Design a protein around this ligand. Structure first.
Ligand code: HEM
Ligand code: HEM
Ligand SMILES: N[C@@H](CCCNO)C(=O)O
Ligand SMILES: N[C@@H](CCCNO)C(=O)O
Lengths: 201, 201
């Protein structure tokens, strides 16, 4: 990922906020020069992405994790709100379309996690916390988690580098930008909200 | 990506449909064992993903494409609708949460495309076609496209292998499945629609 200057994060906490808000990530390895990717829920431990630790799990039947045992470098992609930007919205000419989005790419060394029950229980807690009502596992469900453990593989990534893209129409003049934000306010409020926070500081 | 049997596509056209419907893709290379990824619009040429050709573009200032000149194998990830599945919706116990999603992973040999204007013009046509009204470039905008060309790099992927995941609650018993579909019908109609099509044949 390349980040033009005008799409860079305005604050270092913006990257961590995106990661926490969008835990359904893409975990990517380079198995002997061939990229392999798994979609998996991944949570953040720490205040910042760079230097932080990511925790996730996948299916034991998914052979991807067997590439982790050597502890190679992996890439974890977190994707926030996104949406196609049509020049119909710009109301200007000439023009070209684009796609608006935010994402965090975290790269670091993967390792298998022995404490898989802790990882999955922390993932439940993180993903249910913003819901009302939130689901709390019954004691029977916690026993079910224990029974499921032989079929899961948990892992940690120690993040060496972080890059963040906030591609949110900052390349447009102010009158056009306002039109884009108004259009997403109806069609994609999560993206409009992200545009608003990107202008902060 | 690993695809359990009950999440496999029911029809071979399902993968192509997802690709056409979700052109904002992730292009992934293995630059000397390190995964690198760029978010870019990618369109499909052909009736099937496997054996088909993908066409995309990226920023020339993005150094990712300089890894393509040797024509390595790349992975292109197309992501359809997705959403967190809370056990609150299941109304059963014991239970564990999951994430529902659909995706197509296309792997093949990348090559730079000299015909960049054709690629970007076909991308405009594909992404505007489902809109009403659709944006058609003015002659002035087509000249603007020509003026932008030195700053863009277009590329082709010849897809050798395709895998498709339709992880859409098929592991749940029928009464629970019905509850999931009803909940997404309100919260995420694109995902509910995908659940409906997954049961076809
Ligand atoms: C918010 C909570 C959770 C989410 C979003 C989630 C999501 C997922 C996803 C997307 C996969 C597929 C990974 C792959 O393709 O390799 C998976 C696999 C798996 N997870 Fe979770 N999971 C959650 C909680 C749990 C818990 C609490 C356990 C308890 C041990 C668990 C155990 C498993 C197992 C055994 C598998 C592999 C087989 C299966 O799909 O049932 N997960 N999970
Ligand atoms: C549906 C139509 C289009 C979409 C969704 C789209 C989207 C994008 C995206 C996401 C990028 C950033 C890629 C990266 O990070 O490396 C990009 C870059 C670029 N694209 Fe497009 N594009 C479209 C049409 C066009 C057209 C018609 C042209 C005309 C030549 C063009 C020229 C460029 C150029 C010059 C760049 C790099 C600098 C810039 O961002 O302006 N694109 N495009
Ligand atoms: N940044 C230029 C060209 C964008 C082409 N890719 O989206 C514009 O906004 O007109
Ligand atoms: N497939 C099991 C466990 C799912 C855990 N990961 O989502 C269930 O649906 O209960």
């Amino acid at each position: 990922m390349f980040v033009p200057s005008y799409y860079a994060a305005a604050r270092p906490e913006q990257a961590a906020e995106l990661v926490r808000s969008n835990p359904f990530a893409l975990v990517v390895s380079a198995v002997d020069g061939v990229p392999v990717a798994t979609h998996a829920p991944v949570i953040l431990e720490g205040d910042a992405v760079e230097g932080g630790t990511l925790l996730g799990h996948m299916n034991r039947a998914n052979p991807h994790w067997r590439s982790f045992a050597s502890s190679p470098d992996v890439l974890v992609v977190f994707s926030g709100p996104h949406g196609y930007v049509s020049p119909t919205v710009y109301a200007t000419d000439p023009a070209a379309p684009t796609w608006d989005y935010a994402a965090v790419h975290a790269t670091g060394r993967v390792e298998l996690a022995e404490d898989a029950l802790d990882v999955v229980e922390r993932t439940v807690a993180a993903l249910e916390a913003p819901r009302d009502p939130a689901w709390t596992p019954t004691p029977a469900s916690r026993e079910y988690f224990r029974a499921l453990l032989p079929g899961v593989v948990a892992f940690r990534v120690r993040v060496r580098t972080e890059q963040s893209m906030f591609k949110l129409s900052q390349e447009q003049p102010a009158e056009v930008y306002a039109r884009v934000r108004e259009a997403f306010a109806a069609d994609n409020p999560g993206l409009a909200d992200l545009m608003d926070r990107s202008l902060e500081h």
